[PDB]
């Protein structure tokens, strides 16, 4: 009410030379209107004065008006409809850059009334003789569809597939594919042959669009599906990674001696995606993580490509590490453990903790290398690093559960590492190893007494494992540890206020006071010994190799 | 007490900044950019009272500009909202339906108005009649 | 592709263009809250929040976001976002907000001719000269090392890093963070034979009344987000920084203080450790101020211990350890001797084993040109020591 | 006219680097000129405008001080404006500036003294306090001083007291400052009240005679054509007079105290009246006096009749149109409810606050609504407040949800009437928002169920329907298993709550929950073996399944294997 | 063959003559182009390509990294003496971080070659 004048000011001074007669400094004016409203200045009062500059013959000045109009076409569409009479005069002008830019500007306006204006002037643009205009009109059908005469436009998209300029063919296929999400049949004789010949000549973004459409096609005969694949095979040599991953998605679908030759031609293009820029390697390695599950015989020999390089980002280091495990076999476990030992000495504390856990995943997967993984972790603990030692205790615990009564010489070396333990899960791993095997540990009660003095202010995982261990120590060594169990069950049932802790204290208190012989088969019995997408979801995500369903490893229903 | 007075548009660039507190030149730039990080976010139904780093900021927008006064936490925030509006009305008759560009071209006259009305972190003169009596007398001197 | 967003260094929208109205104006700030200002979230080039996917590529400052709602080819959008910025770099030189602000008109002419309803068109810079009318607005020998002596040898090469930083905070009793900044330094201890040249790498939480500031040691040469240097032998301050954005706050004090008349006072204070439970804060001391006319108080504590100190006029409450994602409470009952009480802030001391600015070390590659050792022969240690400075909550 | 050319020459730059070259070609031009005084002040306005854009200026100070010694007004006020903005610490310049100010202060031109008094009050360094702080009270005292100079001198002495209190000692001039409250020019009184207020913060008893002068002037102001501001008689002076009275206790003279009552009664009585204008600037100026009136009544805490009328006036602002009055009424009632006198009258507004909490959108006003509910809680209304907060938490946003859960659990234990209500309260709290409930809150709920027998049929019942929801919190599952495992027999008589249904209700949530949550549900599965022998076949296959025996956790395995051997042996 | 490292903006200095760096010209780069260290088998090839077409300006088989094929200059950490195949050629780099990746990728190759020899000695 105070700083709105319309007699003087910046809006007044802008409105002045926009009304002037020189063309070249009305062009400077509209640039000042775009640069005002980009930063966030309110130039809504200049709207009927900018569209007076539409009636001209200059191409540069007419685009600057259209750029001003496009910024209104999405946020406040009810204002940009007020100049729609100037659009429909421009969409039959010569200099067909004006005709295409008129049709784009009309299509981007979300107003129900504009469908009366994307009538009959649109169908001339679908039949235009400049292919740059047919390219524009092909997309604007999908703009109009996203808002029965347009059902007559749908067959005009099919007519544009038979064109000599292939970029017109490209956007028409991309238009039909988005329309077919909410409704195209690609029957062989003329559709597939004209798509694959346009595939060899169109631009790099249209080859994505054609190879995304062929994945919807269902072939019938086995050598008919083979006859497609000799044309798709040279498309996995392209510079773009989006073209290669779309070519793979067709070839992973149309996979019914040429079978053996095709799987040998999938491995060099998937290797060469990893020389790319780090966002692309993430998109590739999330798909490589799916391909080595469904077809593990493609990249069986290529584990050296997947070794983590130091300057990779953290989202490429963690995805390269999941594929090194899936290719970890007995023929190459020795160089994997050369790498996993090396990554565990890096300064990235987030990545070292996963490299040490990847060692125990190689011991569980490759059973023949269990001793080499145990000797690898022992060399890590001798470094005395705080975040490696207490990580490797967790991993050794899962080996003792997996391979019991084999590796228990090393506990005399693990038990001297107690003062380097401050994680709750890492302390609970040593208490389990002291709780088990206590007829092998010399001073198991002197170790477990050192934890009961600080029984509170420990985690309930540590409190429960220390409860389970001292009961196991009692049934293994009665009459030495009578003081510990009367200590810890007084700590559990009387001092602690956790209900889950104090009744587990009771269940042990009831069993020891009923029959310690009966408690031996209950507590100290032998425990039964103890990571891949299930093939319903897995075979779904191979049908979406390029897309975000494979980057997320989730079906498209959750998007 | 008042600690500064800001005038800045939605573009972010200031039209007046008078400081009543001893800050460094880069600290003055640091506060300015994080005032309109507060003021531009708030809508027309939020309150005009934002706590700001240990004191409070008081604003009102005049359709292209923000007048921000930054006072202590104890201060009467409903009286400093009207001393803002009292300061605009003095600028309204002194510049004859003031625009934004009167603050750009005549910044040295704006410091005369602020000294006339807000001196040493307090409100000096509230009367619109006596300020316009004083400012036009200095205009012809 | 629903809309290309180009954000500045600080997280503000420089220039943007939406192509699909499935994208709202909620999505321009959905990226700001949950990608740029992610406090503890580990970075990913594609993230998904609330049925909307976020593609971003950084070019040295600038967040180039790409927003979509469909199951689009993700390798398509990233290969687009490289050729979206190679078109711009061929017109601007580099990509920065000083070049983008000079070129709001050229980007708008590009963001229509390159991308059309989310469908990438021909991005060839030779073909664009027929379509783009506007023009871009353009804008030896180190001899001897002075700081490191020659012929150093050690029995075993080792290397120690300490990221040492201190949190400062003023927070309202409602939970609004009023002011926060972290002051830190990377102290490196180099026990390395020979004269190694080594490369250091970190994440992007450092900008290379507190103001965001970073100085280096004179050994460091800056020219990616990597740093090459030749470390002096021994104790050595590698980097020295302050930061103010996206501060990780380890604790929260919730001061529920009720005045009963003018003769009695009860104070409830709740501590919530706001970090992951595998970590463990230590040396925790919450001093709670009392009025000047306090007779004697009655304090009960859940864990830890507290004692009233009339010489300080404050209740000092000390906890030995606190695991993350937990909660403690103290209660107090003050009797007074009958103006109003001006409230000092509840100050707090602690020490956490993580770096509260978000700084992390990604790699540290040590290379000696003329000896028989390399990086995997070098034992490296990393330790994060978070600490409080002025960490206070209004009562 | 040369300035407006240069500014629009900067504004017509199309890049940042075009500015730097245009600035530097002008900085090189101005440096070459360093003249007519008109041509000298034009360049300083150029140099000042370059500074305010943020560019570094490292000259021009000696040219600006040469403007201070001029005799035309515009050359002086541009010279002082350069000095006030660009503060240099050259010891030669500070000597030259102080001599230029002593020339203007010794002058009897009121406009030349007005520039000098502002330049001291804008820079305010110690070197200007060391030369001037003995002259400024002499100008304020003297009877020949113009009233507009009396305004600027009083506020200039205010900053010299704020910057360096030791260089402004009190004395003879203090008894004549308080006489300015009797002055006819209200602008002089306005600059006087700000001066007396800050000086009475540390030496209150010296300025004690201003208490009687403040009330008598305020009684005339409340009960001036140039000082009305939208039909309100002198709002900012009446705000400053009410802040002056807050530096003191209620006065010694009961004739002063009685006069202080009806002026505060008049302010309250005007608030009840219909407004004399529709514009919001009338009501903001009208209420600016009112909230400082209420802050004075709270400060004294001496007339309970005024406190009751003040609380009744603040209840009118809770259901008000604008957000600015709803927020300030909630801050005031939090400070008002703590008093001995108004605390019973705030409690009558319990219906008004909750109806404001449910409908307010603004998150700042919404959380001061919660603080008022916590502040006015008592034994008499705790069941009402807690039940209304729980009715808010079912539809609340996640922004305010954390602090309300903390306040429900604090009011529940503190004001627990019996032990049947508290158990019903927190179990209702864990069902609604269980992820914000601390475990020592959750631990004590079970200790009351175990210790006392009467609630056990009621607690084990209410947990069972709480578990029938598809979206239970994981703390609800943990309190769900332990109570049904201990007291499922107390509700086994219901065919809707049959023992096989209680097991299937828990085991439907045994997955999709955490690792210590699964370990607690195993503990009650064996309690269903002990209590419910007809369920025993349906539990043991769950225990002997591979998902519990070959479970990757140690503690989930050790607890599942022991319970399979308790059930068979 | 695999490609170990690709570096643009790499200078080639003809050497006028030990091995100090200020002795060379350091202002007249005798050749400029793109650097690629390729390797196949047990050796590594330092191939110099022009920026535009990619023709092989020079090539140096290495076969041991601290050996005689690549020798560091004593003044700086950027300049290298290359035995192309014969003759000796002086390289150049822009900063340390380009010379860092030159030196690490060579050593990371011959670390792998030492391990594959050691696996054959098992």
Numbering used by the authors:
A (entry chain B): 5 to 151, 156 to 191, 196 to 268, 275 to 548, 553 to 581
B (entry chain S): 1 to 141
C (entry chain M): 2 to 140, 154 to 222, 241 to 255, 260 to 374, 379 to 435
D (entry chain A): 11 to 44, 50 to 238, 244 to 589
E (entry chain N): 7 to 23, 29 to 96, 102 to 138
Which passages does the manuscript contain on this structure?
Clathrin-Mediated Endocytosis (CME) enables cells to dynamically regulate the composition of the plasma membrane and mediate uptake of transmembrane cargo, such as ligand-bound receptors. This process is orchestrated by the clathrin Adaptor Protein two complex (AP2), which interacts with much of the endocytic machinery and functions during the earliest stages of CME. NECAP is a coat-associated protein that binds to the alpha appendage and beta linker regions of AP2 to facilitate endocytic accessory protein recruitment to sites of endocytosis. NECAP is a ~ 29 kDa, soluble protein composed of three domains: an N-terminal Pleckstrin Homology with ear-like function (NECAPPHear), a central Extended region of conservation (NECAPEx), and a C-terminal domain with low conservation (NECAPTail). Here, we determined cryo-EM structures of NECAP-AP2 complexes which show that NECAP clamps AP2 complexes into the closed, inactive conformation.
To understand whether NECAP binds to the site of phosphorylation or a conformation induced by phosphorylation, we determined a ~ 3.2 Å cryo-EM structure of the phosphorylated AP2 core bound to full-length NECAP2 (mouse). We observe density for the entire AP2 core, with additional density contacting the mu subunit. The remaining unassigned density at this interface extends from the amino terminus of residue 159 of mu, and can be attributed to the phosphorylated mu linker (amino acids 154–158). Our structure is of sufficient quality to build a near-complete molecular model for the phosphoAP2-NECAP complex, which shows that residues in NECAPPHear interact directly with the phosphorylated mu T156 (pT156). These data show that the phosphorylated complex can exist in a closed conformation and suggest that the mechanism of NECAP binding to open complexes that are not phosphorylated must be fundamentally different. We also noticed that NECAP R112 forms electrostatic interactions with the T156 phosphorylation mark and may be required for binding. Indeed, NECAP R89 lies only 5 Å from mu pT156, suggesting that it may also contribute to coordination of the phosphorylation mark. Additionally, NECAPPHear does not block cargo- or PIP2-binding sites and no obvious steric clashes would prevent AP2 from transitioning between open and closed states when bound to NECAPPHear. One feature that might prevent NECAPPHear binding to the open conformation is that mu T156 is packed against the beta subunit of AP2 in this structure. Nonetheless, while NECAPPHear is required to inactivate AP2, binding of NECAPPHear alone does not explain inactivation.
